[PDB]
């Protein structure tokens, strides 16, 4: 957590050393492509989809089944989200904290942290417009915030 | 460390160097010019007519009256005090003569005990003081 902050974090997952396996379990390449697409129909973000398979269907790495990452499977079938997931959550956070700063405007700690989210988005939207996921003409305003999250 | 080291970073180094020269007083003194508004006018030696004779005295701890003539210059028509070296020598100079003045030799500033004046008289009447003080040349 080093970006907009004082602090040096180190805390995350570490992938298992062997991508292949495990023979001991029991799962299939074709059956797992159905189950990913199962949840994405009902409106879940790929960050949560892998976690449901981990905690229901004992799927450690989903790659280690299919040979394929989760977002590729959705885009292969042709049914991912339109916005990136990291971008979606920030604009959904930033519209909510701006809703708060209407009501009571004295918390400058709210204002200071409205920037540093609004700042984070303008970094990401640049990155995604290079990869050509969002078209040049796409924008983020206060008026256009609720249109994109919905 | 404490500066840009990278391959493409030669504009930062060249342009930052030009700024830091203006801290250096020698570059600052040369460039300002800044030297023209000077009695010498940046010339090592100057000449002109004596106005009179003045006694200016040393600071401290050195109790002594120094005897520096007032001299109008030729080219500027300014006036400036100027020290007369060697004992006697004020008597040798005469009133209302032409004299050649030069610097104290300190590259500006005020030299010894003697404040104010920054100038010494090299010649009088086209002869030179050393010859006069020694008495191997004459004045009428």
């Amino acid at each position: 957590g080093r970006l907009h902050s004082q602090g040096k974090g180190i805390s995350s997952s570490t992938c298992p050393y062997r991508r292949s396996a495990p023979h001991w379990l029991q799962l299939s390449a074709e059956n797992c492509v159905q189950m990913i697409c199962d949840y994405a129909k009902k409106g879940v973000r790929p960050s949560q989809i892998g976690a449901l398979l981990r905690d229901r269907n004992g799927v450690g790495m989903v790659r280690a089944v299919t040979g394929v990452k989760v977002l590729r499977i959705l885009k292969a079938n042709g049914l991912a989200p339109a916005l990136p997931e990291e971008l979606y959550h920030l604009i959904k956070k930033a519209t909510n904290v701006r809703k708060h700063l209407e009501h009571a405007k004295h918390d400058v700690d709210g204002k200071y942290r409205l920037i540093l989210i609004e700042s984070r988005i303008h970094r990401l939207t640049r990155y995604y417009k290079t990869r050509r996921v969002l078209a040049p003409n796409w924008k983020y305003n206060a008026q256009t915030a609720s249109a994109l999250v919905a | 460390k404490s500066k840009a080291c990278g391959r493409l970073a030669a504009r930062k180094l060249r342009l930052a160097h030009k700024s830091n020269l203006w801290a250096s007083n020698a570059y600052r003194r040369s460039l300002g010019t800044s030297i023209y508004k000077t009695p010498l006018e940046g010339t090592s030696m100057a000449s002109g007519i004596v106005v009179g004779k003045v006694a200016v005295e040393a600071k401290q701890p050195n109790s002594a009256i120094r005897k520096a003539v007032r001299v109008q210059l030729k080219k500027n028509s300014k006036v400036v005090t100027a020290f007369v070296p060697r004992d006697g020598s004020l008597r040798l100079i005469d009133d209302n003569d032409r004299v050649l003045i030069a610097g104290m030799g300190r590259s500006g500033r005020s030299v010894g005990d003697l404040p104010g004046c920054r100038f010494k008289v090299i010649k009088v009447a086209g002869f030179s003081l050393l010859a006069l003080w020694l008495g191997k040349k004459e004045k009428p």
Binding site: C15, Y17, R19 | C5, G6, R7
Partner: protein, 128 residues
Amino acid sequence: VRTSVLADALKAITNAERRGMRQVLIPSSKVIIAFLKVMASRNYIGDFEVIDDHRSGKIVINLLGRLNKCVAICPRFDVGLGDLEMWQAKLLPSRQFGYVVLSTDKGIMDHEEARKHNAGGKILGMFF
């Protein structure tokens, strides 16, 4: 941020040699592995193990205890044979030992190799 590896790693090896350790733990690379290989030919170092973690890598050096500094200078200056014998006089302490690892077109090799092959290139650092 890790600006450079070959720069960073040779600092850690030097801090082992001052202290007088037996072995050191360096994220690995393909220039760092070659830089260690070239000083292994001149017998400044022992013999080392470039381990896998499906990641950047690690190296475990085995120190022989015969080594004073590894620099790695940057930025990577171009150097060409006629120009080179200035960079010996600056960088090394003596004339009579210590080598200047530069990546010649053929590969990364000492100055003593590079003048034999007649190929200059960009320089990485030195050791002595």
